[PDB]
Amino acid sequence: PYANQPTVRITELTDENVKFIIENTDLAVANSIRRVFIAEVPIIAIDWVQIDANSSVLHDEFIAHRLGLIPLTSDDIVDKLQYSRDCTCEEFCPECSVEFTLDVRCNEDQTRHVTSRDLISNSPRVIPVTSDDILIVKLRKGQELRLRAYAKKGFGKEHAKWNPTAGVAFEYDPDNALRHTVYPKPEEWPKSEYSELDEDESQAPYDPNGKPERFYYNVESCGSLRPETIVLSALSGLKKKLSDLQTQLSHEIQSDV
Amino acid sequence: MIYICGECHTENEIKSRDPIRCRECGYRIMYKKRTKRLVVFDAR
Amino acid sequence: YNGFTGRKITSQIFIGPTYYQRLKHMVDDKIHSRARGPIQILNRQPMEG
Amino acid sequence: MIIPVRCFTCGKIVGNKWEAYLGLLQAEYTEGDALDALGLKRYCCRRMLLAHVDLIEKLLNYAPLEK
Amino acid sequence: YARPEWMIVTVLPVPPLSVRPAVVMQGSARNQDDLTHKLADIVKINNQ
RNA sequence: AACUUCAUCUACG
Ligand SMILES: CO[C@@H]1[C@H](O)[C@H](n2cnc3c(=O)nc(N)[nH]c32)O[C@H]1COP(=O)(O)OP(=O)(O)OP(=O)(O)O
Ligand SMILES: [Zn+2]
Ligand SMILES: [Zn+2]
Numbered sequence: 001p002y003a004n005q006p007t008v009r010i011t012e013l014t015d016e017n018v019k020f021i022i023e024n025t026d027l028a029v030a031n032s033i034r035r036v037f038i039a040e041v042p043i044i045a046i047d048w049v050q051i052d053a054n055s056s057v058l059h060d061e062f063i064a065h066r067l068g069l070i071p072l073t074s075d076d077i078v079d080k081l082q083y084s085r086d087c088t089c090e091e092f093c094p095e096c097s098v099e100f101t102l103d104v105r106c107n108e109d110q111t112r113h114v115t116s117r118d119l120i121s122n123s124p125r126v127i128p129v130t131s132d133d134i135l136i137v138k139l140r141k142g143q144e145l146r147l148r149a150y151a152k153k154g155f156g157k158e159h160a161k162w163n164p165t166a167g168v169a170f171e172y173d174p175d176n177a178l179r180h181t182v183y184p185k186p187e188e189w190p191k192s193e194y195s196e197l198d199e200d201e202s203q204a205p206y207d208p209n210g211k212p213e214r215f216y217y218n219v220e221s222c223g224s225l226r227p228e229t230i231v232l233s234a235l236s237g238l239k240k241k242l243s244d245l246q247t248q249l250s251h252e253i254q255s256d257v
Numbered sequence: 258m259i260y261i262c263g264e265c266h267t268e269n270e271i272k273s274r275d276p277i278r279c280r281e282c283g284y285r286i287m288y289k290k291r292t293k294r295l296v297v298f299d300a301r
Numbered sequence: 302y303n304g305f306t307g308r309k310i311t312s313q314i315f316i317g318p319t320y321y322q323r324l325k326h327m328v329d330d331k332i333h334s335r336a337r338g339p340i341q342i343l344n345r346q347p348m349e350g
Numbered sequence: 351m352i353i354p355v356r357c358f359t360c361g362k363i364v365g366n367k368w369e370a371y372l373g374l375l376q377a378e379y380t381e382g383d384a385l386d387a388l389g390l391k392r393y394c395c396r397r398m399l400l401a402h403v404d405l406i407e408k409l410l411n412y413a414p415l416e417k
Numbered sequence: 418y419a420r421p422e423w424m425i426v427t428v429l430p431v432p433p434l435s436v437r438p439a440v441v442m443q444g445s446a447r448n449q450d451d452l453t454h455k456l457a458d459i460v461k462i463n464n465q
Numbered sequence: 466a467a468c469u470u471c472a473u474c475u476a477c478g
């Protein structure tokens with residue numbers, strides 16, 4: 001009647017990728033951890049843009065869109081920063097946001113590639129993952145881009161600009177033994193990388209009593225958060241959602257009594 | 258207001274009820290020039 | 302794999318990169334509603350368009 | 351018009367890779383080999399660079415409205 | 418209700434202005450309905 | 466507290 005004790009084994013750990021395996025866990029818990037990876041890990045991204053002068057070919061809201069999609073280093077202070085709704089101050093302040101500035105003019109004849117490097121942050125911890133560079137616009141001679149931006153904490157449920165991850169690879173039952181997928185012709189199907197079968201055997205024998213366990217994850221970071229801390233923050237955020245749910249549930253049960 | 262010229266790209270100030278001709282080029286197509294008030298764009 | 306539950310979809314699904322076009326017909330241009338609006342002079346009936 | 355930041359399907363940053371892609375194509379690399387060198391693995395990300403048409407260069411030919 | 422003589426037109430009914438509204442443009446001008454122009458022609462010929 | 470008509474053409478299911 002109680003929760004199982006899950007186990008984690010990390011196979012690969014690189015600045016861009018974490019490959020790990022979670023065993024003795026439910027499919028629902030595993031899938032929802034993946035789901036939180038994608039949508040419920042807080043990150044910092046530009047959400048306020050004010051363009052003083054835009055003589056580039058791209059219109060203002062195009063530039064704003066591209067600026068929002070630019071990743072920003074959010075390793076440490078995203079936990080410290082508050083949401084704009086939570087912050088007491090009106091509009092935005094150093095606690096709820098980070099300010100960026102762009103002042104580029106193409107005085108020279110050669111085309112000026114405005115990059116993420118040209119974005120200058122008021123706080124050193126958030127930088128546009130520059131330490132090539134993301135190209136915001138190309139400026140012909142006599143064309144100028146000037147803008148001020150504010151970056152706020154948020155998660156990917158709001159907007160895909162706040163996705164901390166690129167691709168979450170989730171696989172269970174590498175050799176089809178639970179028959180969750182029924183191949184019409186099993187031999188035509190390529191083997192998984194995690195498959196332990198011999199080359200002759202296309203599918204493992206049907207396990208009637210089996211349950212999905214030993215889930216395999218490959219989480220690729222977008223560079224804003226380290227791939228390890230994406231997973232840690234996802235676990236902590238899911239735990240916090242459950243705890244908030246429990247608090248509200250206890251309050252309503254007390255109210256009913 | 259101040260209207261930028263279509264061809265020579267030089268700002269010229271034209272009063273109301275005045276013919277639309279840029280000084281020093283004579284082009285008859287002017288552009289109103291961007292507003293001072295600033296509009297907030299959500300990056301979304 | 303099913304996005305909501307994580308279980309493998311039993312029938313393997315045909316996926317690939319196909320070229321798609323956004324046609325000019327958009328819902329915002331077509332949504333319309335009328336409630337005691339402007340009325341024609343000759344017929345004194347609701348207007349058209 | 352300009353290389354999109356982030357692949358639509360997954361979200362890996364592809365915006366910084368267009369100039370390097372063009373340089374590697376100039377080197378001798380085939381499109382596939384350049385895409386591999388840039389690190390693009392999934393066909394979703396390779397579609398972003400492979401199918402991209404850079405119109406910003408054609409638009410930059412026209413003279414700016416204000417100089 | 419209908420005598421054969423009444424079929425021959427000796428008096429022409431002129432419809433009310435509701436039937437033939439005056440189409441106004443910008444207050445600068447007032448176009449007249451086709452019926453108004455035809456009635457003007459009829460009145461001119463009748464006066465002649 | 467509030468903007469005509471004709472005519473044509475082009476699209477939509
Ligand atoms: C199925 O019948 C409908 C209706 O009868 C109505 N309709 C459409 N055009 C007209 C018209 O000119 N005059 C009248 N009176 N009715 C009309 O449209 C018909 C079908 O037309 P379609 O054959 O193109 O439908 P796809 O089979 O093409 O559907 P996809 O796969 O594109 O969604
Ligand atoms: Zn604040
Ligand atoms: Zn001029």
Ligand SMILES: [Zn+2]
Nearest residue numbers: 357360394395
């Ligand atoms: Zn991709």
